[PDB]
Amino acid sequence: YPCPNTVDCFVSRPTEKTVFTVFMLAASGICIILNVAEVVYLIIRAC
Amino acid sequence: YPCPNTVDCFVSRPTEKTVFTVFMLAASGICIILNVAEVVYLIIRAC
């Protein structure tokens, strides 16, 4: 509402946003892996 | 085509056109009945 039925809306710079989305998500995934390795390394260091 | 998905289009004077449609169709139906009566009356006159 209030758009009647289904309307076609166009996203600004879909490909450019997709490229930066891939870069940011890949960096976030690297952060997740590094944080997991950080926990494992610290646990190994303690034990 | 080319209207995307379904669009809402508005008819000009829908009620006024409906009223005149009823008048014309009723008159046409009267013409049909009168023509049938014309054929029957002429057949009866011949026989």
From Swiss-Prot, chains A, B:
Transmembrane segments: 22-44
Effect of residue 2 to R: In CMTX1; suggests a failure to incorporate the mutant protein in the cell membrane
UniProt-reported outcome of changing residue 38 to K: In CMTX1; non-detectable levels of hemichannel activation and non-detectable levels of electrical coupling
Effect of residue 43 to V: In CMTX1; localized mainly on the cell membrane forming gap junction-like plaques
Tree of life domain: Eukaryota
Effect of residue 16 to K: In CMTX1; non-functional channel
Impact upon substituting residue 45 to Q: In CMTX1; non-detectable levels of hemichannel activation and non-detectable levels of electrical coupling
Subcellular location: Cell membrane; Cell junction, Gap junction
Annotated coiled-coil segments of the chain: none
Family named by the database record: Belongs to the connexin family. Beta-type (group I) subfamily.
Subunit structure: A connexon is composed of a hexamer of connexins. Interacts with CNST.
Role: One gap junction consists of a cluster of closely packed pairs of transmembrane channels, the connexons, through which materials of low MW diffuse from one cell to a neighboring cell.
Reported disease: Charcot-Marie-Tooth disease, X-linked dominant, 1: A form of Charcot-Marie-Tooth disease, a disorder of the peripheral nervous system, characterized by progressive weakness and atrophy, initially of the peroneal muscles and later of the distal muscles of the arms. Dejerine-Sottas syndrome: A severe degenerating neuropathy of the demyelinating Charcot-Marie-Tooth disease category, with onset by age 2 years. Characterized by motor and sensory neuropathy with very slow nerve conduction velocities, increased cerebrospinal fluid protein concentrations, hypertrophic nerve changes, delayed age of walking as well as areflexia. There are both autosomal dominant and autosomal recessive forms of Dejerine-Sottas syndrome.
Name under which the protein is recorded: Gap junction beta-1 protein
